[PDB]
Every structure is written in C-alpha cells, then in structure tokens.
Amino acid sequence: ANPCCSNPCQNRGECMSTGFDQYKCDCTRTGFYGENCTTPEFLTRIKLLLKPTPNTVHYILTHFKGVWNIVNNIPFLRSLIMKYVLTSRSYLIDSPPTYNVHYGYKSWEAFSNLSYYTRALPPVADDCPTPMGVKGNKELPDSKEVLEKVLLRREFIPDPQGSNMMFAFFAQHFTHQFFKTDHKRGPGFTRGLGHGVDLNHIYGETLDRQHKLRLFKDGKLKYQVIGGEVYPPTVKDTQVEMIYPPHIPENLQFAVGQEVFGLVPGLMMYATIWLREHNRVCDILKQEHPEWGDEQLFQTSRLILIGETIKIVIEDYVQHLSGYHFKLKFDPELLFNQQFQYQNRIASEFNTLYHWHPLLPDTFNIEDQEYSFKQFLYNNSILLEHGLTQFVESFTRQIAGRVAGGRNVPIAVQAVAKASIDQSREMKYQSLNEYRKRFSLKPYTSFEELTGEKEMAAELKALYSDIDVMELYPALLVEKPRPDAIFGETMVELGAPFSLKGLMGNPICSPQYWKPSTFGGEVGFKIINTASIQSLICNNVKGCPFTSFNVQ
Amino acid sequence: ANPCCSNPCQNRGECMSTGFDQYKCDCTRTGFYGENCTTPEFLTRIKLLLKPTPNTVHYILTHFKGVWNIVNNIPFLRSLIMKYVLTSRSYLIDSPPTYNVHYGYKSWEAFSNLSYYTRALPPVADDCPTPMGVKGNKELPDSKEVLEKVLLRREFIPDPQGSNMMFAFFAQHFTHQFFKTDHKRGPGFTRGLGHGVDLNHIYGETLDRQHKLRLFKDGKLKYQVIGGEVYPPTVKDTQVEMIYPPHIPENLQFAVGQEVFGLVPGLMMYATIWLREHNRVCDILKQEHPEWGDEQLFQTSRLILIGETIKIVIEDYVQHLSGYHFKLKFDPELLFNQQFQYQNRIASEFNTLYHWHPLLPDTFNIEDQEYSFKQFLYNNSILLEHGLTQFVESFTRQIAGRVAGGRNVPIAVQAVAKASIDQSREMKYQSLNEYRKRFSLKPYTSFEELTGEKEMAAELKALYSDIDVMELYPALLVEKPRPDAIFGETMVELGAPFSLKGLMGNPICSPQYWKPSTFGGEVGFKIINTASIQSLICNNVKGCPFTSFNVQ
C-alpha cells in the first residue's frame, strides 16, 4: 500500500509518498539525481571510479608486514593514517539520529525519546505486502529451520584469529553497558540512556544506584575481602537490585553496576577487575590531591576509567579483531581539525550484529576443570574457588569460536539466536542487501557468493528463494569470512562506523574535555594514554599474570 | 581554602588545586601559556593585534546603511557575511557542556544529568572566603538595597529601538519553552529536558501531556470555537494540568502546552496563534499528502513549526533588537562546511540575563482600555473580550520599555527582580568582570564606566566598594546601553552565543534533517523558509492585521 515499500530511492536518498500510489525521492547531498537517485554527478563519477573496495582496503592493511612496521615507528605517518581511518569510517553514521522502530520518517518524538534504539535504516512499513518490502514470499522462512540448518554448531569451530575467552568476556562486559534492552517495552527500546560508553555497568545507570555502590570515602567504591582478595560487595550490604536465581546464597549475591553481571563468572571477573582499578585510581588521585574530597575523587576516577576503556578498546580489542599490521591509536586530537559530532545514539542494528554467541565454547575450561553451561552460569563460587589469577590464566589459554563461516552457535544458547532472528523481524528490519547498500557495499548476487561455499548456500536458497530477501543477522553468522578471519565483510563494514561513533563520540574526546586538568593533572592523563589490557590485569590481579586477547 | 578561589587562570585556562594551598593552570588550546595562562603565543599576538572590539563591529553593522543595502541584495556576499556571524559567535560556548550549579570540575554527573542548567562559568567553591572568591566583604550588599536604588522604575523609560508588546510577549512566550526552572529542586534545575526549541510550550513536555492536547484527527491539536473564533481547549474536557487561581471559571481555563501560559493574556495570545498555525499546516500537509495518517501529519507539522520558529526568531526577532542594517538570514547550509556541534544545553546564565522585565509597561493598553497588572494577570476573559485581532493591533502600538540604562524594573514585579539577585548568589555566580573576561570583553574599571553616568554609579560604589565584586544580573539592567539601543555590550556579547547555539544547534539544522522530505516535501519546506511574524499573524488572525516588533 505504501508506495515506498519497494525501497526505490538509492544512494541514501529518502522516500516520501506523494499520493496513494506515487512517491518522490529526495536526493539532497547524495551525489546523484534522477527519479530514484541513480544518475551520478561528474564529481561523483570520479569518486566512484577512484574509491577502492573495502576488501582491497582490508588486504593492504593485513599484508606488507614490513611496510607497516616502518609506518608504525613514525608518529607522523601513523597519525595521518589513523586520522584517515577515523574520518572515512565515521562519515557513514547519521548524527543526530533519525529513525527508530516506530518512525520510518523523521520526527521530534524519534529524536528526543532516548528510550528507543536508533536505526541505521528505517523499518519496513506496516502496510507493505512482504516482510522485506515487495520481494519474497508473504512470510520469511521458519526461524527455527534457519537456526538448525546454518546456525547451530555441529563440531566446535575455533576462531583462526586466536581470540580467547578473555576477549569474549571483555566483549560481553564492554558491550553490555550500552546494550541493555528494555524488555518491558520491546526489542527496540534500551535502558542505557547514556547511549554510549559511560561505564554505567560499573557505577550504575541512576544516581541512587551509584550512591548505594559508593563508599563515600576517598571516592572509592564499596568492596569486601574474601580470602584476602577484593571482591564486589553483597546485595545485603548495598541494597542494590541484582538479578539472581532464588537458590543463590546471600554472600554470593554480588552487587555491581549492571544488574545482570551475576549471570556468568566471566562478567564478574571483569567487574572485579574494573572495581579494583577504580579504587586504585582513587589512591593515585588522593596521593596527588590530598585537598580533594570524596565526590571529586570518585568523579575524576570515573572519567579516567572511561578514557582507559576507550584506550583499551581501540588499541587492544579493536586492534586484535582487525588483524591489521597498522597499530591503531586512541588520539582525540586527530579529530579536532575535522567535522565530527561529539554525540552518539546506540543503533538497534549495532545491537543485532554484536550477538557474537559463536565465540562461546562447548565448555568453560578453568585451570584443570571443564564446566558445562549448567555448571558455569550463575555460579560465582567458581570465581571464589580459583581466583582472578587462575581465571585470567585459564581464559587467556582457551580459544574462542569463530563468529562468521556459519554453523557455530553453541546449542546451549540457541534460543537467543532464534530470538535474534525473530526480534529482527519484529522490528521490521530491511534485508541484508539493503543494509549492504546503505553502507556502500556491493549487494550479493547469490547465496554462494555470500557463504563462499555450496552446502549452506543450498539450504539458504531453499529457504529464502531470493538473495534480496536474506535477513541481516543470519547472514552475518554464515557469511564467508575474510581469509583466516573471524568476521565477513558485512560485519566489519557495518559495525566499524557504529563502534567508532560510540567511542570517539564520547564527550571526553571533545577538545574542551581532552586536557590533563580534566583528569586531575598529567598523572591521571598518563593513566589513560598508557592504558592496556595487560596493564589493567597486572595492576589489579595478583601475580601480574600475562594476558592478551589472543592465544599463544 | 581552595587555592583557585581567586580565579587565577586567565583566557579560559582551567584551574586545578595541586595541594592545600597550591594551584596549576591548564592552558591547553588557549593560545596562551605561563603560570596563569597570560603569556601569548605568536599566533595569539597576531590575532590580538587584528581582532576588532565588539563595539567596533556593532558600529559597522549599525552604520553604513547604503553599503548594507547593496550587500543585502548580493546573495553570495550576504551568505558570506552571515557565515562569519555564525562562526565567530559559535566559538564561545562549551559544547558538549561542562559545569553546572554543583560541579566546578568536569564530571560525568555534570554532563549526563539533564535536569541541571549548565554553566558558562563554574560556581564559586563553598569554602572561598568571600561570595565572589577572594574579593569584597564576607556578604554581598542588601539585594533589597540594590533592587530599590538602581532597578525599581520611578518613571517609565520607553525603549528607543521602539520594541512593542508584540515583541515583549513573543520574547516571553518563545523563551519560556527552554526556561522552566524546577523550583522543587532548585534554581539550577530545569524542567525543559529538550534544552532548546522543541515547542513543548505548544505540544507539551511529556508524551502523556501531548496526547491530552492532541485531537488524533489529521494531526491537529484540540481546540474550541468560542464566538466563531478558534481558542485552545478547556481543562474541563481535556484534564491537562494548568496553573490557575482557584476562582477562575472552568471555561476560562485554556489548556495549552506550557502550564503557566494562563498567567497573562499576552502568552495566551501567542499560544492561540501558534495553535491555529499547527492545524493550518496540518490542513496544508493533508492537502498535499492525502495518504498520510494522524501521527505523521502531527509530527511533520511540529517539525515545520519548529522551523518557522527558528526562522522568525532570527530574521524578525533577533533582526529587531540587533539594530543591524545587514539583513540576518536563517540558512543551515552555511554551517555544513564548518565545525559546529549540533547539540545544545541551556545555560543558567542565559536564563539569568533573559529576565527582560523592564520591557513591561505600567499598564496594558488594549483598544481603549488600560488594564493594570492586577486586572491583566490570570484574566483570559480579556482575550475573549477583545479578540486576537484587537490584541495584535493594540500590542503592535503599545511600546515596551528599555531593558538596560537602569531603573526600569516595574514595581509590580519587584519580587521577581530581587529573586533573580538572590538566586544568582544562591547559585554562586561569579562576578560581572569574570563573565566579561569569559566572553572576551574588557573588564570594567569603574562603576561609572559600567553605568555611563554618575548617580546610579555612586550608589553602586557605596554598595559594592569594588567593581570586581559587581554582580552580573544587576549590571545587565543598569549597564550603559549602546547608542539609542535597548541593551548594553554585556547583554549582547554574552547572550548572542547562547542564543545562536540554541537556534542553529537544533537537529533540524543538521545536514540529514535540512531537506524537503523531512517536512513533507517542497510545500512544507517553503512554509519554513518564507515564515515571518507578519505571515504568522496574517494567516491565523482574522482580518490580517498589520503587526511588527517595532512601533510605527
């Protein structure tokens, strides 16, 4: 019924109904004119004839190891390249945000209501005949049939990039501060009104929760000592709301910023590490400022751990995922002479493609034990039995699973993957190829080009019939990976602009914030600029055990 | 005891305590270096030797009328000059925001908690020996003594720029959407979470209030027809809460977006005009999009009226009180190639200096009646008595009062002007000269330099002793005005950046919003780009009465 259901406007042109049966494409600043914005301009012709494909941009960055070794040892050449990485990626995001799950058109309700996730692409209209628009059958294939045929794990497929459980649990700990779906409203609503990296999973979403977690002395957070080790406090001691099964004793009901981090001891591991780091920074600032009160010590510490988070994510977490020989660099000054919006709204699609459940192994191997999912979930006495030291040493050695390549979602969490399929349809996601076009990628012409193989492509083609009807989420998990990589092209090219806008879009990277006095002088400024996952564990885990995001 | 109470750092360098009695200035990206950021760099010595004073630029813009008559008709030259106006004023506001009433240091609470007003200057620390820091007596002079000696109006002083009551009530109506102090929390807390021009004074702050005001047919707002004229609906049949005295009849309680607009018929006049304009735009959009539903007609009408508001404010409202011969232009495209944060946070000082009560006369002369403050306030029966047309014609003729120059605050609202003094000290405002240095203005060396005369200056000399202790709010109302103007240098050079960042920092001025499809096509786009106070009255007030912001 809606004349824009076929998604006619190309090259990011906006569609608007002009009557019951007619439409018009607004091609403003798209580089193209014509009915559906497909006729390029002469300057656009030159750029399209010169812009290299992302797979070529992935080859030079992962080859010529000796040439990148020269560039890395030159600050000028490294900064000029890192600046190009920042700007080229960040141009793809709409900031301020536009659409959400309920508005396929711009409106003030969509912009102002921070409870919605935002949308890179507008949702399909209710009165469209097919789920994707006009293409495909009236009903998408059975989500359980897609789940069992191409998603579920037969034999465990390890990640060829060496990603370990330290990386996987870091990915789960980090992303679950801005991925906090409000299941009371719907899959398109969020509870992290910060919409970014505010470390609410450490300090609390609301002020009242924060004050319950604070000691109100030297800016530190409340803690307890079990067996000589610093662990988060209990629910009984702080009276914060946590999510635990009714069979969990009171001394094991740990209280952390995120109310669900008692789900798995992997999240509680990082929650304990970051808690210790906060109090460690409180001791440093108090050493440098005996005149500061409790509130300033807490606040300045919080800002320092935020900078440490963004520093570790870019230079370690993203560095490992990229597989680049070029050393990425967290430097906000690279954007001061550029056009960049220091804001961010968390996108629903970013939430979808971050369901990296294939990372999870069949068993969690700690020291000389192999816990199943039943034994590991909601059992933090495991953490107390082994300690952070052996926890780090065990997760550093155990390798995680490959995300792309298909058929690697462990069956323990199969209902989550099936829900990621079902909820994507509930929120009226557009097709995979529509999101590939939205991010300047060539649309797949067949299921075999997508998967890079024949068997899964045959099962998909029997289910979806036409490639233009393939859904985004299952395509990500079964996409052909880059050579010996963990992700395909769609995962990287769509997630990098979201990931970059959420890290650099933080206010601490803005010129008025990025200065030593914001972090208590040059001593606190050095804490951020020398942060690393290795130094985070070495400063807060006994014995200073070697850790990394890759297996040795 | 705080070593930063003397505000030692100059040129926006940030002070930080480095001990119980030692401080350090952070001169990062200030153009200066040294202990208190006072030694200029080479590029700083060149800019300080080439930048003209604000009064010089005001002279050039208010003189050479024939030259501006040529520039106004050269579209490239006019856009070029308006570009310089927008960029030079933008550089002064901290965006993302920094301090508030409770945080003199940058903190995540200060940035995230949207209930606060932000602060262009940090508050004075509570442990400083004097209210202003280290200068003046232990207590500031009697606010009643200041109010009665330099503020209370003995004889009405008309505005030399000819501002009428159409302007005075437009200022009151427009600003009272982002100036809504939360008196349940404190003067530094706002109830306007949009922090800008979201037209919540028409549609409501919360979604539940908006639905009470909406008719849910053709996107129109509810209304009633009294005597053949369109007026807002009553609280009796809408249940939306309004502030009315307990004696007001049920059918005289008009229900509009802002709960306090029943305070004066002047506010209810503009609320009625804008209500009509929304339903008129709805008729225009439905005429062009007969396939749209209620929600999209409403949401698009809202975005259009927001655009109309920013248009009228820049090209009529700001055009009137600037006194410029250069015709101001509202054109978001002038910032697409410029560094500009498309976000805004309402500053508390912007609220402080927008207290333009000297505009009010001693009586409100409508047609042939002269109503006192007692008769005018909370008397919507006056509006139904005379009608909108007579209201527009009467207020166009009645001249408002001069805001600067001293002694023009009407005695009927003396309780307000004292509160502005008290609440400013309660919020620990810094001195007048400290705020002048904050906005690149020369500090006043004497009270006579501030007032431009002898009498009021000698009174302020005997109250404050030192000029560096003079407060911001009373200085704005007693400052020497510009020649035959309404405001002084401080009122203009401090308020213009706040006003700029609030108008152009709106999301609809961002590139992904400034296009026809956002506003329902080229017809709705034309409603924004050809809006004016004259067309607003002509399209919505019966008879198309002549109106203006200046008396004829």
Ligand code: HEM
């Ligand atoms: C280690 C054990 C893990 C378990 C038991 C688990 C299970 C779950 C469950 C139950 C949900 C919520 C389902 C729903 O309510 O719709 C979820 C969501 C999610 N998972 Fe995991 N997962 C694990 C690890 C990970 C890891 C390593 C990542 C890495 C990125 C990850 C990424 C996500 C994300 C981003 C969400 C969405 C968050 C939200 O919408 O609130 N998970 N997972």
Ligand code: HEM
């Ligand atoms: C026409 C009759 C008017 C009356 C009876 C009136 C009276 C008042 C009152 C009672 C307040 C509340 C003070 C407080 O809550 O502490 C106030 C505040 C204020 N007035 Fe008016 N005023 C009038 C017109 C105007 C005009 C023409 C302007 C022009 C700019 C103006 C600007 C303001 C502002 C900006 C505030 C601050 C409100 C806030 O921060 O919430 N007022 N006035």
Ligand SMILES: *[C@@H]1O[C@H](CO)[C@@H](O[C@@H]2O[C@H](CO)[C@@H](O)[C@H](O)[C@H]2NC(C)=O)[C@H](O)[C@H]1NC(C)=O
């Ligand atoms: C913003 O800050 C204010 C003040 O710190 C918070 O309001 C306080 O809330 C507590 C409850 O947590 C009350 O006991 C206080 O009386 C409140 N003070 C004032 C002045 O209102 C407010 O909750 C914060 N906003 C958010 C979203 O956290």
Ligand SMILES: *[C@@H]1O[C@H](CO)[C@@H](O[C@@H]2O[C@H](CO)[C@@H](O)[C@H](O)[C@H]2NC(C)=O)[C@H](O)[C@H]1NC(C)=O
């Ligand atoms: C953001 O939007 C949601 C949904 O449009 C709002 O939630 C609704 O709130 C109204 C009351 O205002 C309730 O009657 C509905 O039942 C709610 N629906 C859902 C799905 O939650 C929410 O209030 C909006 N937030 C803001 C700040 O306006």
Ligand SMILES: COc1ccc2c(c1)c1c(n2Cc2ccc(Cl)cc2)C(C)=NCC1
């Ligand atoms: C500088 O801008 C960025 C920010 C994050 C990036 C990034 C580029 C690249 C990658 N990341 C991390 C990332 C990507 C997708 C998702 Cl979903 C989450 C994180 C990856 C994995 N490869 C190379 C390019």
Ligand SMILES: COc1ccc2c(c1)c1c(n2Cc2ccc(Cl)cc2)C(C)=NCC1
């Ligand atoms: C484009 O940038 C602006 C925005 C608003 C402006 C402005 C410049 C100028 C003025 N205004 C309006 C205004 C200023 C202060 C306050 Cl407190 C309220 C309104 C004035 C008064 N004259 C010349 C310069």
Ligand SMILES: CCCCCCCCO[C@@H]1O[C@H](CO)[C@@H](O)[C@H](O)[C@H]1O
């Ligand atoms: C862990 C897998 C549990 C569900 C598997 C049964 C669903 C049928 O899936 C079948 O499995 C075969 C073996 O992988 C594939 O070769 C077939 O292509 C596929 O159709």
Ligand SMILES: *[C@@H]1O[C@H](CO)[C@@H](O)[C@H](O)[C@H]1NC(C)=O
């Ligand atoms: C795109 O434009 C062509 C004409 O150039 C038209 O035939 C076609 O229908 C348009 N696309 C869609 C999806 O309608």
Ligand SMILES: *[C@@H]1O[C@H](CO)[C@@H](O)[C@H](O)[C@H]1NC(C)=O
């Ligand atoms: C929890 O882990 C411990 C190992 O420390 C194990 O003995 C226990 O059985 C586990 N509990 C459950 C319910 O799996």
Ligand SMILES: *[C@@H]1O[C@H](CO)[C@@H](O)[C@H](O)[C@H]1NC(C)=O
């Ligand atoms: C500022 O610097 C001067 C010398 O540069 C020094 O004498 C003075 O104490 C400093 N502080 C103040 C508040 O003037």
Ligand SMILES: *[C@@H]1O[C@H](CO)[C@@H](O)[C@H](O)[C@H]1NC(C)=O
């Ligand atoms: C309200 O205004 C009317 C004129 O419309 C007047 O007759 C009446 O006395 C006024 N009421 C008060 C309380 O001043």
